[PDB]
Design a protein around this ligand. Structure first.
Ligand SMILES: [Ca+2]
Ligand SMILES: [Ca+2]
Ligand SMILES: [Ca+2]
Ligand SMILES: [K+]
Ligand SMILES: [K+]
Ligand SMILES: [K+]
Lengths: 253, 261
């Protein structure tokens, strides 16, 4: 079976030939029309058959038996749907490859800004092919944090605002997560991801020495997904502590 | 002896050379000086200086109102530039992305040329009275009509009472924040956001938006719905025509929007 060099080589070429499906979808002058891509999912289903006949794909509808597959791809063809629909910007393609359950390749493609982030085990992380280094230490009071504030209880919201440097939000799990990997954000939180919302993220967190865990501090199952944090190492513990304090982060009423 | 064409051309020339200056300034950035609450860096400081040198060479009779200047700026100035050398300074410092340069020219009080320069994303927005508004030379038309419940909004969730923040959460489609006023405003201009709110801007935070708001048929008012003096600055909204009073009605309701009351 194939080398990561050969797989990545073929993946990068495939992504670069989806500039032939979005311009058209950016149409939407009649969504929903976004649900149907999905074309993207199915076209990548074709790429696997053509190239990697034993590889399987986990994506939004439909899968089915998930453990234990040798060669597994997990995809969000469009992460940041509201952004694509409302903004035509700040959305991305997420792809991740797992071998015997080990993350081997990850991609986050910021198609609107022409930025491909890639993670390769054995080589490192890259953005348009220039090597990403471990971000510098970020304490919570020195960092910008990103989360959905409409979905947490007000007191937990207040406390995050007070303990952080600032708050921002891009609105695509994949992009808010790259801002963490890049040192731009100290942490990103998602209170209800699907496995494809965070699958690429594991290898970047590993290769760039980030913490990526559940909100209870535990290791995440890539096949199932969980309320999740990706964080700079110097502010991981403090964010979790704010989230879990005074009976937790969940919003009621 | 200067047409708007000729002025735009030198400004465009000035903007273009700043990319041989900024990368080096980002590298030696930066480690509070002359600011009460605002952040400042070597980058803002040099860009301002460089633009003052521009006016000295091409437009010696024009005045500059900017983050570092305060000057005594009578409403009887014929040719005035209001500048934000870097808008989104926190963004610059922490992220090196989502900051912009803001320039606005006013002739006897009337906005004539406006520039919002998204340097990290090389998108230049400009508006020219008589020609229209442009994003990288591509013409901007009025954004499609957008109601609150269908629109994304942006604002600082940290400086309003949380009950106003909730109502606005409920009434809008979603919420995002870029974190530079000029950029969150340009989102409203191209129909990406329904509205953007700054509760306490300075003239340079909003100078360029007046002309974009006229030409793109946007609503740009105080949070009372009134005209804004381009020389003083008041709590402000820049909004799609269709969600403007809904945003203000929610903001002004239940005792208003201030955090401490
Ligand atoms: Ca998603
Ligand atoms: Ca500034
Ligand atoms: Ca500013
Ligand atoms: K909490
Ligand atoms: K809502
Ligand atoms: K209110």
């Amino acid at each position: 079976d194939k080398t990561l060099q050969q797989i990545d080589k073929l993946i990068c070429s495939w992504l670069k030939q989806i500039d032939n499906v979005i311009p058209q979808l950016i149409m939407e002058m009649t969504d929903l029309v976004t649900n149907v891509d999905k074309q993207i999912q199915q076209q990548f289903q074709q790429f696997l058959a053509t190239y990697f006949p034993e590889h399987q794909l986990l994506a939004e509808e439909k899968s089915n038996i998930t453990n234990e597959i040798n060669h597994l791809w997990i995809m969000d063809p469009i992460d940041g749907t509201a952004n694509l629909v409302k903004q035509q910007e700040d959305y991305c393609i997420i792809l991740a490859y797992f071998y015997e359950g080990k993350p081997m390749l990850s991609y986050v493609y910021d198609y609107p800004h022409k930025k491909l982030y890639k993670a390769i085990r054995g080589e490192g992380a890259f953005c348009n092919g220039i090597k990403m280094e471990e971000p510098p230490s970020l304490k919570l009071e020195d960092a910008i944090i990103s989360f959905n504030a409409q979905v947490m209880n007000l007191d937990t919201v207040q406390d995050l605002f007070d303990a952080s440097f600032s708050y921002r939000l891009v609105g695509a799990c994949g992009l808010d997560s790259m801002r963490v990997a890049k040192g731009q954000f100290g942490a990103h939180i998602n209170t209800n991801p699907k496995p494809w919302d965070i699958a690429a993220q594991f290898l970047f967190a590993e290769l760039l020495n980030l913490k990526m865990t559940t909100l209870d501090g535990k290791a995440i199952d890539h096949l199932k997904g969980a309320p999740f944090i990706i964080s700079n190492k110097a502010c991981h513990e403090t964010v979790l502590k704010i989230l879990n304090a005074n009976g937790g982060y969940q919003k009621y009423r």
